[PDB]
Amino acid sequence: MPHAFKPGDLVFAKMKGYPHWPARIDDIADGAVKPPPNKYPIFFFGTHETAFLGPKDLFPYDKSKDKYGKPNKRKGFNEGLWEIQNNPHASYS
């Protein structure tokens, strides 16, 4: 049975105007800016950007990859597909 989201979980993350995007739940470094309540820090593969999102926009990667893990014209997307499949826990800083 599902737990709550935790750092290191792999997802497709949805934002307005963009396709469901390969991403992970990040940790928050000591001394770093925390997310608002009920939000998670989402690191987007390929673009390497961070946004804060709630569970309604987070789709577990294993269950969703058949639907969302296809190439896309958008900047950074196909790089992101490689990262989430091949080294999803690496440092991308």
The candidate with the shortest Cα–Cα distance to 5, out of 39, 37, 32, 29, is 39
This structure was determined by X-ray
Distances (CA, A) of 65 to 39, 46, 59: 23, 16, 9
Please, are residues 83 and 90 in contact by the beta-carbon 8 Å criterion? yes
Quote the Cα angle for 45-72-56, to 5°.
60
Question: What phi and psi values does residue 13 have, to the nearest 5 degrees?
Answer: -115, 135
Q: Are strands 50-53 and 21-25 parallel, antiparallel or unpaired?
A: unpaired
What value does the CA radius of gyration of the chain take, rounded to a whole number of Å?
13
Domains and CATH numbers, the chain: 12-29+38-78 (2.30.30.140)
